[PDB]
Amino acid sequence: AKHPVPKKKTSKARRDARRSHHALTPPILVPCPECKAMKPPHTVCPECGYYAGRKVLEV
Amino acid sequence: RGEVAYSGRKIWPQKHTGRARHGDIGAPIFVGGGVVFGPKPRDYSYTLPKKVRKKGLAMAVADRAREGKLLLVEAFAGVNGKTKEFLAWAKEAGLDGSESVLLVTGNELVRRAARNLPWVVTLAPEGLNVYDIVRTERLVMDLDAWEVFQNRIG
Amino acid sequence: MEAKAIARYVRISPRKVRLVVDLIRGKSLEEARNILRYTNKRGAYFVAKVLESAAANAVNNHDMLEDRLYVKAAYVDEGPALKRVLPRARGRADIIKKRTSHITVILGEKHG
Amino acid sequence: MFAIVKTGGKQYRVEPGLKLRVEKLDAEPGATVELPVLLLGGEKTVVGTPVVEGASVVAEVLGHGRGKKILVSKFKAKVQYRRKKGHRQPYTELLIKEIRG
Amino acid sequence: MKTYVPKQVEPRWVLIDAEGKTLGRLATKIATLLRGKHRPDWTPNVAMGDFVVVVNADKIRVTGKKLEQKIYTRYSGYPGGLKKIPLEKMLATHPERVLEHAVKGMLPKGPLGRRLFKRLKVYAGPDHPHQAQRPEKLEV
Amino acid sequence: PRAKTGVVRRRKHKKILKLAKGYWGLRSKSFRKARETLFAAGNYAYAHRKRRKRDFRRLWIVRINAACRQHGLNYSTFIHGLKKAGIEVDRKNLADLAVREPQVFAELVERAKAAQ
RNA sequence: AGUACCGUGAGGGAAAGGUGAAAAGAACCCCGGGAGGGGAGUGAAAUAGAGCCUGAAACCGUGGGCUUACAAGCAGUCACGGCCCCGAGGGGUUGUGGCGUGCCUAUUGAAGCAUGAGCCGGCGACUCACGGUCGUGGGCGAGCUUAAGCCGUUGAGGC
RNA sequence: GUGAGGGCGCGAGCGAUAACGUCCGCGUCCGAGCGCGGGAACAACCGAGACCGCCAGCUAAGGCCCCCAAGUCUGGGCUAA
RNA sequence: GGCGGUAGGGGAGCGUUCCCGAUGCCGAUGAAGGCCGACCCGCGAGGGCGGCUGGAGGUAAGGGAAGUGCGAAUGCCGGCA
Lengths: 59, 154, 112, 101, 140, 116
Ligand SMILES: NC(=[NH2+])NCCC[C@H](N)C(=O)O
Ligand SMILES: [Mg+2]
Ligand SMILES: [Mg+2]
Ligand SMILES: [Mg+2]
Ligand SMILES: [Mg+2]
Ligand SMILES: [Mg+2]
Ligand SMILES: [Mg+2]
Ligand SMILES: [Mg+2]
Ligand SMILES: [Mg+2]
Ligand SMILES: [Mg+2]
Ligand SMILES: [Mg+2]
Ligand SMILES: [Mg+2]
Ligand SMILES: [Mg+2]
Ligand SMILES: [Mg+2]
Ligand SMILES: [Mg+2]
Ligand SMILES: [Mg+2]
Ligand SMILES: [Mg+2]
Ligand SMILES: [Mg+2]
Ligand SMILES: [Mg+2]
Ligand SMILES: [Mg+2]
Ligand SMILES: [Mg+2]
Ligand SMILES: [Mg+2]
Ligand SMILES: [Mg+2]
Ligand SMILES: [Mg+2]
Ligand SMILES: [Mg+2]
Ligand SMILES: [Mg+2]
Ligand SMILES: [Mg+2]
Ligand SMILES: [Mg+2]
Ligand SMILES: [Mg+2]
Ligand SMILES: [Mg+2]
Ligand SMILES: [Mg+2]
Ligand SMILES: [Mg+2]
Ligand SMILES: [Mg+2]
Ligand SMILES: [Mg+2]
Ligand SMILES: [Mg+2]
Ligand SMILES: [Mg+2]
Ligand SMILES: [Mg+2]
Ligand SMILES: [Mg+2]
Ligand SMILES: [Mg+2]
Ligand SMILES: [Mg+2]
Ligand SMILES: [Mg+2]
Ligand SMILES: [Mg+2]
Ligand SMILES: [Mg+2]
Ligand SMILES: [Mg+2]
Ligand SMILES: [Mg+2]
Ligand SMILES: [Mg+2]
Ligand SMILES: [Mg+2]
Ligand SMILES: [Mg+2]
Ligand SMILES: [Mg+2]
Ligand SMILES: [Mg+2]
Ligand SMILES: [Mg+2]
Ligand SMILES: [Mg+2]
Ligand SMILES: [Mg+2]
Ligand SMILES: [Mg+2]
Ligand SMILES: [Mg+2]
Ligand SMILES: [Mg+2]
Ligand SMILES: [Mg+2]
Ligand SMILES: [Mg+2]
Ligand SMILES: [Mg+2]
Ligand SMILES: [Mg+2]
Ligand SMILES: [Mg+2]
Ligand SMILES: [Mg+2]
Ligand SMILES: [Mg+2]
Ligand SMILES: [Mg+2]
Ligand SMILES: [Mg+2]
Ligand SMILES: [Mg+2]
Ligand SMILES: [Mg+2]
Ligand SMILES: [Mg+2]
Ligand SMILES: [Mg+2]
Ligand SMILES: [Mg+2]
Ligand SMILES: [Mg+2]
Ligand SMILES: [Mg+2]
Ligand SMILES: [Mg+2]
Ligand SMILES: [Mg+2]
Ligand SMILES: [Mg+2]
Ligand SMILES: [Mg+2]
Ligand SMILES: [Mg+2]
Ligand SMILES: [Mg+2]
Ligand SMILES: [Mg+2]
Ligand SMILES: [Mg+2]
Ligand SMILES: [Mg+2]
Ligand SMILES: [Mg+2]
Ligand SMILES: [Mg+2]
Ligand SMILES: [Mg+2]
Ligand SMILES: [Mg+2]
Ligand SMILES: [Mg+2]
Ligand SMILES: [Mg+2]
Ligand SMILES: [Mg+2]
Ligand SMILES: [Mg+2]
Ligand SMILES: [Mg+2]
Ligand SMILES: [Mg+2]
Ligand SMILES: [Mg+2]
Ligand SMILES: [Mg+2]
Ligand SMILES: [Mg+2]
Ligand SMILES: [Mg+2]
Ligand SMILES: [Mg+2]
Ligand SMILES: [Mg+2]
Ligand SMILES: [Mg+2]
Ligand SMILES: [Mg+2]
Ligand SMILES: [Mg+2]
Ligand SMILES: [Mg+2]
Ligand SMILES: [Mg+2]
Ligand SMILES: [Mg+2]
Ligand SMILES: [Mg+2]
Ligand SMILES: [Mg+2]
Ligand SMILES: [Mg+2]
Ligand SMILES: [Mg+2]
Ligand SMILES: [Mg+2]
Ligand SMILES: [Mg+2]
Ligand SMILES: [Mg+2]
Ligand SMILES: [Mg+2]
Ligand SMILES: [Mg+2]
Ligand SMILES: [Mg+2]
Ligand SMILES: [Mg+2]
Ligand SMILES: [Mg+2]
Ligand SMILES: [Mg+2]
Ligand SMILES: [Mg+2]
Ligand SMILES: [Mg+2]
Ligand SMILES: [Mg+2]
Ligand SMILES: [Mg+2]
Ligand SMILES: [Mg+2]
Ligand SMILES: [Mg+2]
Ligand SMILES: [Mg+2]
Ligand SMILES: [Mg+2]
Ligand SMILES: [Mg+2]
Ligand SMILES: [Mg+2]
Ligand SMILES: [Mg+2]
Ligand SMILES: [Mg+2]
Ligand SMILES: [Mg+2]
Ligand SMILES: [Mg+2]
Ligand SMILES: [Mg+2]
Ligand SMILES: [Mg+2]
Ligand SMILES: [Mg+2]
Ligand SMILES: [Mg+2]
Ligand SMILES: [Mg+2]
Ligand SMILES: [Mg+2]
Ligand SMILES: [Mg+2]
Ligand SMILES: [Mg+2]
Ligand SMILES: [Mg+2]
Ligand SMILES: [Mg+2]
Ligand SMILES: [Mg+2]
Ligand SMILES: [Mg+2]
Ligand SMILES: [Mg+2]
Ligand SMILES: [Mg+2]
Ligand SMILES: [Mg+2]
Ligand SMILES: [Mg+2]
Ligand SMILES: [Mg+2]
Ligand SMILES: [Mg+2]
Ligand SMILES: [Mg+2]
Ligand SMILES: [Mg+2]
Ligand SMILES: [Mg+2]
Ligand SMILES: [Mg+2]
Ligand SMILES: [Mg+2]
Ligand SMILES: [Mg+2]
Ligand SMILES: [Mg+2]
Ligand SMILES: [Mg+2]
Ligand SMILES: [Mg+2]
Ligand SMILES: [Mg+2]
Ligand SMILES: [Mg+2]
Ligand SMILES: [Mg+2]
Ligand SMILES: [Mg+2]
Ligand SMILES: [Mg+2]
Ligand SMILES: [Mg+2]
Ligand SMILES: [Mg+2]
Ligand SMILES: [Mg+2]
Ligand SMILES: [Mg+2]
Ligand SMILES: [Mg+2]
Ligand SMILES: [Mg+2]
Ligand SMILES: [Mg+2]
Ligand SMILES: [Mg+2]
Ligand SMILES: [Mg+2]
Ligand SMILES: [Mg+2]
Ligand SMILES: [Mg+2]
Ligand SMILES: [Zn+2]
Fold this sequence. Notes:
The structure is cut from a larger assembly and holds chains A, B, C, D, E and F.
Chain B: H1 50-67, E1 70-72, H2 83-93, E2 101-104, H3 108-114, E3 120-123, H4 130-135, E4 138-141, H5 143-152
Parallel strand pairs in B: 1-4, 2-3, 2-4
Helix pairs in contact in B: 2-3
Chain C: E1 2-10, H1 14-21, H2 29-37, H3 43-62, E2 69-78, E3 82-87, E4 93-98, E5 101-109
Antiparallel strand pairs in C: 1-5, 2-5, 3-4
Helix pairs in contact in C: 1-3, 2-3
Chain D: E1 2-7, E2 10-14, E3 19-23, E4 32-41, E5 46-47, E6 56-66, E7 70-76, E8 81-87, E9 90-100
Antiparallel strand pairs in D: 1-2, 1-4, 3-9, 4-5, 4-6, 6-9, 7-8
Bound molecules: arginine, magnesium ion (172 copies) and zinc ion.
Chain F binds three RNA strands through α1, α2, α3 and α4.
């Protein structure tokens, strides 16, 4: 290895075009069928402690 | 660069450093270093030919005479070292203060009375010069001052 | 009417918090609230604090209804840098820039 | 009815009531001048050889002016030769009064 | 006075029979027609040429021994990927491509030249499908 | 007395950067790249305002040629006919007649044919 | 400040000034753990709020207009067209066509696969003394001129 | 200031009737005309010495079937490669 | 009638700092500086003018004197890519 190195400073255009795929995707949330609170699917509701229509965890 | 207050050590080696070659930080290429061809104490005085000075004095008084702004007086009535007395004397002699006057006389009392006016420049006769003459719009002199001026230009 | 809130000198990299700010711009206040709540990023905390301060400003200061609030503007600026020394091999000294952010959120009323 | 007139070294097609910038003319503003005709067209067609004899276009000089400044600049590489000149072409404004056949 | 720049006009459709004609001598005329240089309102920055339909391109003729000697070439980008096809095999496999290449090589390069080439329709055999456009038979 | 740079260099850099409005990237943002691009642009402008006359003349010739070939002859035949006839109507107005007043151009074509 | 920092040591040796006329330096309330901010309040002014006069440039961002996913480029220029703005005119933008080998330095010759430069801002290089030699503006002219000093001035000249 | 010249033509020498070789003479051009037209492109080959402007005209070399401005121009002959 | 131009010779101007002009003049009805302009004068360097910022200085005609104009020195210091 002979220490590869950038040949030219990247133009703002090129670095931002490279970053064109960096946008976050927003979370995935559904309403809990008990307290109607938005929560991730297939998780136990952290606002009421219910999942599959029963208590599992003290909230 | 020799007068600056730094040492003369080479900051880093000549070669194989990656930086640029340099000597000491007093070099004028550095910030805070010496200044190339900076001004030193000088003497801007020179000897102007004497006849040129004398002829220039003559010519300045001659210009003010040909203009009609020249006036000779014998004495100064009753001014004795007070600005108000000189203001009265000048009002009577036709000096309202709208033109700057060069008063030249041997009487110290008159020069003391007049020297604080914003439109009056006082001079002893032996100190007549072409600058102060061209400076002012009118020229007033003693008869003694006139005689010693004739004796200087002679 | 608008209601803005600014968190200045937030010790985090702008390019990092902007990623989360871009997630909530133009969204309704409740949408933005849940979105920030379940966003797996460090700047989610700070954007959430700024959004809540803005909503409080709106309600308690500019006569705006809570159920009418949305994120009209939302931008991060870059603040001063905390330059630290980082020792590398062979006696060389690097400088790490610990950046800082100025989060700004501006809310308005969505009539209708 | 139109007329191809020649002035300032160049030929323009004019019609009555047309404003036109041509090269500068030695003529006081508001005065009137006759422009030669090389070809008359429209209702009738007479072809100049090279001009037509008894035909002239009467136009009224509206005034004189200077055009939009052009920055003519010359640059010669590796030789430290650079030149900057501003140029404003003097013109005259004419309004075509009538076509005199 | 400025030079007249035409408004976008309706282009005219033109049909040409290639049968028995000389390849290049017809190709130059097809290209001129595609340019719009036969119209007195011609402009170089717009596409205003004709739509040229060609039939019986399979019956083009050519001088000399060019049947076995003219060699079209294609470099596929790989090592040794140089295809050399003679005119005979071309006429017997993709005969309209002969005229297509002869015309494409005579239009300007760039985007406008490409769309001008898109305005030409070459057809082997006597039949074409552009009966809807109703072309005008031209004796070039 | 000491005359430091002060205010001048910034004003000269701003003058050169104003002319650079519209250039790609640093060619409008860096004073030096701006200056280089402006050297190129100025030489381009001189040479191209020279070449524009030939450009337009060549277009005029193409149009006159199309109109002439609509009437039998070609461009060269037509210009020879004009030269012999005595007609000194330039090619700008000639194309303007070829498109705007085809009857006058047809009359010119007639005089050109007959003038040989 | 001969400080911090560097060095065993002799020794080297920085950066760093500015709110306002007056602290009148923001009580109290609101979100927040705090920081920070939002109202209130002070002020002629608070993008004068202490990270404080003026606040340029590179540089990072939000919004708006024009434009961009079949296209070959020292990135411009010339022409035409479309869209947007300000009211036979002009500005902004760029679709297509034409033309077009960065700058500096060094060389017989560089776009050059020869040198230098990431970019911006500030610092950065033909001077001074004395003598000489030409030319030039004056003064005097077979003459021209004083040096050190002395007197006077306190930016007055004279001897 | 320069006292590193270089290409081309002619006359020679050196070289192998070799070199974008080398050394002189006469000339020219580049250098400094890497400004313009031609020669596909190209300092020195051909045309020609760029004060600035014009949507005017005439020519030079070179060109006139398409790219590409102008003749698929006229008369005679040769070539089939 | 002349006016491509490297080395180089000469000519004419612009601008920066300071002094005489100035116990004057401009200035809170807004100084210098900063951000814009498609407006005017000048071939040009530049000078005007108008709007915004700025909050206290600036300085004519005509002369004088220099620490007087930056894009490169693997320049120097700082800031940010
Ligand atoms: N009498 C005199 N020579 N006076 C000369 C000037 C005195 C003093 N410096 C003044 O102007 O008031
Ligand atoms: Mg290895
Ligand atoms: Mg590797
Ligand atoms: Mg290894
Ligand atoms: Mg590897
Ligand atoms: Mg490595
Ligand atoms: Mg960048
Ligand atoms: Mg960019
Ligand atoms: Mg990229
Ligand atoms: Mg961007
Ligand atoms: Mg709970
Ligand atoms: Mg030193
Ligand atoms: Mg020393
Ligand atoms: Mg020392
Ligand atoms: Mg020392
Ligand atoms: Mg020391
Ligand atoms: Mg030492
Ligand atoms: Mg030393
Ligand atoms: Mg030593
Ligand atoms: Mg260095
Ligand atoms: Mg040094
Ligand atoms: Mg030193
Ligand atoms: Mg110093
Ligand atoms: Mg110092
Ligand atoms: Mg110095
Ligand atoms: Mg020195
Ligand atoms: Mg001394
Ligand atoms: Mg002395
Ligand atoms: Mg006094
Ligand atoms: Mg006075
Ligand atoms: Mg006084
Ligand atoms: Mg005085
Ligand atoms: Mg997430
Ligand atoms: Mg609330
Ligand atoms: Mg490590
Ligand atoms: Mg080391
Ligand atoms: Mg170690
Ligand atoms: Mg870095
Ligand atoms: Mg860093
Ligand atoms: Mg004329
Ligand atoms: Mg009209
Ligand atoms: Mg004109
Ligand atoms: Mg004129
Ligand atoms: Mg260059
Ligand atoms: Mg150069
Ligand atoms: Mg140059
Ligand atoms: Mg045809
Ligand atoms: Mg053939
Ligand atoms: Mg097929
Ligand atoms: Mg081409
Ligand atoms: Mg300087
Ligand atoms: Mg400046
Ligand atoms: Mg300037
Ligand atoms: Mg400025
Ligand atoms: Mg642009
Ligand atoms: Mg840009
Ligand atoms: Mg320029
Ligand atoms: Mg040209
Ligand atoms: Mg020109
Ligand atoms: Mg010409
Ligand atoms: Mg014909
Ligand atoms: Mg002719
Ligand atoms: Mg003619
Ligand atoms: Mg040690
Ligand atoms: Mg120690
Ligand atoms: Mg040491
Ligand atoms: Mg230091
Ligand atoms: Mg203060
Ligand atoms: Mg204070
Ligand atoms: Mg509190
Ligand atoms: Mg709290
Ligand atoms: Mg709380
Ligand atoms: Mg607080
Ligand atoms: Mg807040
Ligand atoms: Mg507060
Ligand atoms: Mg108040
Ligand atoms: Mg006020
Ligand atoms: Mg402000
Ligand atoms: Mg302030
Ligand atoms: Mg600051
Ligand atoms: Mg500030
Ligand atoms: Mg202040
Ligand atoms: Mg700030
Ligand atoms: Mg800024
Ligand atoms: Mg944007
Ligand atoms: Mg497309
Ligand atoms: Mg394709
Ligand atoms: Mg190509
Ligand atoms: Mg190119
Ligand atoms: Mg427009
Ligand atoms: Mg064209
Ligand atoms: Mg283009
Ligand atoms: Mg190139
Ligand atoms: Mg070298
Ligand atoms: Mg070399
Ligand atoms: Mg060499
Ligand atoms: Mg290079
Ligand atoms: Mg390269
Ligand atoms: Mg070297
Ligand atoms: Mg270099
Ligand atoms: Mg570096
Ligand atoms: Mg940059
Ligand atoms: Mg700089
Ligand atoms: Mg010298
Ligand atoms: Mg000195
Ligand atoms: Mg000297
Ligand atoms: Mg001398
Ligand atoms: Mg004398
Ligand atoms: Mg004499
Ligand atoms: Mg004597
Ligand atoms: Mg030499
Ligand atoms: Mg020698
Ligand atoms: Mg040599
Ligand atoms: Mg020699
Ligand atoms: Mg020789
Ligand atoms: Mg040789
Ligand atoms: Mg020779
Ligand atoms: Mg021969
Ligand atoms: Mg020979
Ligand atoms: Mg042999
Ligand atoms: Mg030879
Ligand atoms: Mg030989
Ligand atoms: Mg040799
Ligand atoms: Mg030799
Ligand atoms: Mg050269
Ligand atoms: Mg040389
Ligand atoms: Mg020559
Ligand atoms: Mg070049
Ligand atoms: Mg070249
Ligand atoms: Mg050439
Ligand atoms: Mg060529
Ligand atoms: Mg060519
Ligand atoms: Mg040449
Ligand atoms: Mg001709
Ligand atoms: Mg010929
Ligand atoms: Mg050819
Ligand atoms: Mg021929
Ligand atoms: Mg082609
Ligand atoms: Mg053609
Ligand atoms: Mg023939
Ligand atoms: Mg064979
Ligand atoms: Mg000449
Ligand atoms: Mg010259
Ligand atoms: Mg000459
Ligand atoms: Mg001056
Ligand atoms: Mg100062
Ligand atoms: Mg001073
Ligand atoms: Mg004063
Ligand atoms: Mg004052
Ligand atoms: Mg006043
Ligand atoms: Mg006020
Ligand atoms: Mg100042
Ligand atoms: Mg200005
Ligand atoms: Mg002035
Ligand atoms: Mg204000
Ligand atoms: Mg101002
Ligand atoms: Mg004061
Ligand atoms: Mg000033
Ligand atoms: Mg002054
Ligand atoms: Mg002056
Ligand atoms: Mg003076
Ligand atoms: Mg200096
Ligand atoms: Mg330079
Ligand atoms: Mg340069
Ligand atoms: Mg470097
Ligand atoms: Mg390096
Ligand atoms: Mg470096
Ligand atoms: Mg490098
Ligand atoms: Mg540097
Ligand atoms: Mg530098
Ligand atoms: Mg450095
Ligand atoms: Mg640095
Ligand atoms: Mg970084
Ligand atoms: Zn729940």
